[PDB]
Amino acid sequence: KVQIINKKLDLSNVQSKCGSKDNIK
Amino acid sequence: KVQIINKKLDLSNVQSKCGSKDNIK
């Protein structure tokens, strides 16, 4: 009467941190 | 027919002796 501990894992939406485009304008 | 010799002990109010504040004024 057991069930495996499986979780739905996702890194859904991760943005970059280095502002490599901040001076693109 | 005995009782333990327990006393209520306290150093109630003890003031300092060195006049470290005598010339504070």
Add this chain to the structure above:
Amino acid sequence: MREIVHIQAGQCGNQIGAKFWEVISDEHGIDPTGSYHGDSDLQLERINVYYNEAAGNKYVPRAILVDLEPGTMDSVRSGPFGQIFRPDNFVFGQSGAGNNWAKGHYTEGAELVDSVLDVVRKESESCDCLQGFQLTHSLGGGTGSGMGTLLISKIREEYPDRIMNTFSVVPSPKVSDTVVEPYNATLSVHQLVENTDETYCIDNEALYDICFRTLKLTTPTYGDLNHLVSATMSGVTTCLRFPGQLNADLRKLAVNMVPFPRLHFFMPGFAPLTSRGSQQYRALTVPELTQQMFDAKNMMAACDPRHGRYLTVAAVFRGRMSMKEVDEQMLNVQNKNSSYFVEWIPNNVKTAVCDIPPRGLKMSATFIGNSTAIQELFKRISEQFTAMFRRKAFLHWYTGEGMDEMEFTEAESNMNDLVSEYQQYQDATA
């Protein structure tokens, strides 16, 4: 430094541990008098992990002998290496277990466990840094099973942060030696799965198969099987005693090898194994040791591992070797037989290399495998136990010791749940 308290319980305990201490005393140059007469500094560099030094160049093995009848202890004391053991640690009863787990756990063990635990505390307080406890015992044996379960529970309560390792002799798939072995095994695992950190499953039948097949032995004895088990035990803790290119203590093995808290049983193996005549025709290389380790006929457990998959693999090598060679062999193993490893664990193999080879060998390796295939053992035990329990087979012998039907019921239910967990973790799921 790190110290290991070896607890011996039962007939398996006493015999296997007598052979084990013979092997350990040979490796460290300790003659049957306890006086050091070795030839290398590394023998005394980590002599304190299994020995206590009483001034006078005498070393005492940090071992505790437990039994319920003094016969086996008399046989041990009168045999070789009898005088090295300090006689303080021969703690025995008088009634015996009669192969009844209920008796040994609730009456005789209940009477003797206070003395045994006092001895354990005495040996533990004298330690510098207690690392873990090693228990040698059988499951089918009432003394072994009951006394071991009781002692493991009590010591786990006493030291909840130490490593609890057990080397258990498991029931054989064909030839059982005890009528009430299934009940003893069920009630034993019902506590081992809760209190122990890891358990190595040894089957005597697999050892007989290895002896007749590989070593070409015609008259194998329980002592020679104990020699094999002791070689395995010495290979397990070779990193606690000698330096090497890559060391691994007991806690590292417990961390790398137990993925989930309840799936801690392991299948041990050993290499190399050759008959005396065939030694002159086979070279000792790392590929040879690797092929001997990952072989179904060399598994000391009562199960063909090719029926399930592995979760974790530990391979501790001994002797001067090339790490590139070992790593390439492990890569070849994982690549050619990828279907035998669970998909949810990349890098399934853990490795370690000690620079000191066993006595007489250029190189060796000890195998430790955590395979889902071991569910066959637990399923067969559950089937036999259920069939016996439906007819209340020998049930009065256990109910007379204080057990009720509810304890057997809970043990069987937990066993079914453990089998179901092993089956659950065979799903790739990805």
Add this chain to the structure above:
Amino acid sequence: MREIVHIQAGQCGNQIGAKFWEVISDEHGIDPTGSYHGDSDLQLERINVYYNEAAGNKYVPRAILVDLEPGTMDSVRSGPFGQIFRPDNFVFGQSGAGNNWAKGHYTEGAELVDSVLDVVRKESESCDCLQGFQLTHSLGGGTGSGMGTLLISKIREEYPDRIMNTFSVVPSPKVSDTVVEPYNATLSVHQLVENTDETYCIDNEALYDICFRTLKLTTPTYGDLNHLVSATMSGVTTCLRFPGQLNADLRKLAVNMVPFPRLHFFMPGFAPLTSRGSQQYRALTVPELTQQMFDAKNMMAACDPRHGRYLTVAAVFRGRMSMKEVDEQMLNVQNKNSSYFVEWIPNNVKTAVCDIPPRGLKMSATFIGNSTAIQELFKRISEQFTAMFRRKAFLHWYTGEGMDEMEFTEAESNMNDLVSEYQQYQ
């Protein structure tokens, strides 16, 4: 460690136990004077299991002799090893039993059992760790049957946690030695089934058949049959005295061999058995011992085990052997003949190996089987008892002492219930 108190009642029991003590004294290197003159340390290592040490390098067998007639004890005292027993433990009356179980259980036993129990208590207080009581007696003899039932009840009441083992001589299927054998046997079983832990059923008929067919003996005596029975008795408890690769004491035997508390009657066996001339023609191996043990012609109980199934099998081996050899032989036996074992018990055989063989042999093995076929013996006894009781045959001899018809009726009901239980589990 553990100790055994040997109790020896009846004429049959006295003779069997005399031969048994001769064999035991031979195994431990003890001459008829009691002084130890052996050659191995293991003889003295566990000499306390059967002997008390009376200072002076002499050892006294911890035996108690019981009878209602002094003739057998006179023969024991006058015969060889007659001085080996301390004369304190010869407890005998003067009336005799006359093969009347009612007499020996209610009047003469009621008079003598107090002295018997006082001797038993004195011998038990000298024990460091008392393990079990052994009773050697026949079921037909009035003294044997009555004294055995009464003394077993009394000792079970005094020591409820000790092991009560009995070696009983059972009635023969063809030739009776006593006309009133059925009443005595029924009334004896009616108490043995309640108070004892295990009973070994040895029939003299099977002993004659074995010693004639196998040993090729032409003039067998009670001494030879007692020698076989004593070899079996010594093989039963060889593990309590000598070390071995796998030891099993009385408690493990009682646990493994009795699946349900009432089904505790067993058929003993022994191997190897050979004639003198044939000894030079057959090699002594573990397969040979296994083949001789699991054979209907070598069963010392007059009952073909192939007519039923086994509940459990005990096989204690003696001498140096390979564990894998014995294991493979037992596996082959269970696999080839799986139809003779109950489906609700896997791993039917429990084994043990003692490293000391009997004197003169390289190896041996003692067989202890719990076969459901003994329902044949019990049904024969019940049928003959009913045939005699329906006509009040010899009933007045039992009624005059104090027994009533209700006791015989309850004994018959209990016997038939035991037969029905054996039939249920087959």
Add this chain to the structure above:
Amino acid sequence: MREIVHIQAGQCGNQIGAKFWEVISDEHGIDPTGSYHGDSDLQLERINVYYNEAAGNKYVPRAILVDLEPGTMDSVRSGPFGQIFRPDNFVFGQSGAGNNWAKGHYTEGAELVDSVLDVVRKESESCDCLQGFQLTHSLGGGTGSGMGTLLISKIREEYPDRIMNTFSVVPSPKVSDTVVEPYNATLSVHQLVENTDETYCIDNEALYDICFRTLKLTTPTYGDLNHLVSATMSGVTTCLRFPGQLNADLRKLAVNMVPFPRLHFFMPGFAPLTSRGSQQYRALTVPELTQQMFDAKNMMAACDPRHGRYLTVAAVFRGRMSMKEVDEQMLNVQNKNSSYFVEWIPNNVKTAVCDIPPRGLKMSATFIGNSTAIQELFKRISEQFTAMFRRKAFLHWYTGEGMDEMEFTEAESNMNDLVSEYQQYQDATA
């Protein structure tokens, strides 16, 4: 210098003190002739604390033998060391006590106490600096009990500023040796609690347990129990005889160990204690001595100290040791088992170290504990005494010597008050 007058009274007195003088003469190199034949200057540096030197290299032990029947004294005089004792100090009567405290205290002791006190004054006037009096006697014995109470009262009146130490054999909890032992013990303590400075409680039953259990002795004798008691006695006053890193005389022990004037009973202990065979498997370290001392099975008193709490602990060590080691062990003891010490006494343990070890040992230690658990002894004595007194059991044997019911009543009331005081001082109160 400081001198100790050893007074021997009763059978316990005579036997225990004969063994004690054997041990003391061995430690100082005094052969059975009284002539010094030792090998170290420290043997004669403080030889005068227990010996008087009569010119001719002969030394006489400053001991006084007291009894009421000459049999035990004849046995002592005819045995070993008979000729060293100056025969002036064999002071005995003729009637014996018959185990009746009333007799020995009011008639026979009343007749012999004048001679005994004259001998005491003779030995005391010859001293340079009288330090204290040591009395060896039993409580159950009528001679011991009565003569000791009378002598202690008289000497306390004579020298009120000296140390009055007694080593008393107390009744056993299970096996009593005298029918009238409870009354003798009650009437004895009724005076000991008033006149003595400190009393060490020795039970023969605890000594038997130690002998069968620790020393693995099969045939222990009263003489070997006396050897243990004498080792304890020699360890108590090792600082009065030999130098050391930290010394402590008898008055220092009395000050540090008696918190309140009536709670002066102590539980003695000794370490190390090993069987002959086990000596080759155990090293002698300060942790080993510390663990052996603070062990319930090594207490020579008839009480498990784990039932109450300690007030003061004295631990006098012998042999070359590290003070840091001893102090760390004492800290570990006080920290791990803080629940066994009264909260109103910080720093419960007093220590001392003598540089001279006992004969044949590298190191040893003598334990002296003041535990409230000893109330069990006094409570059992009061219960048994009350049960016997309700029926006037053997009362005529004491009323025929001049005692009335009021003396027994006052003794029992004082005993109940002492038990109540011990119970009162188990309250943490903070």
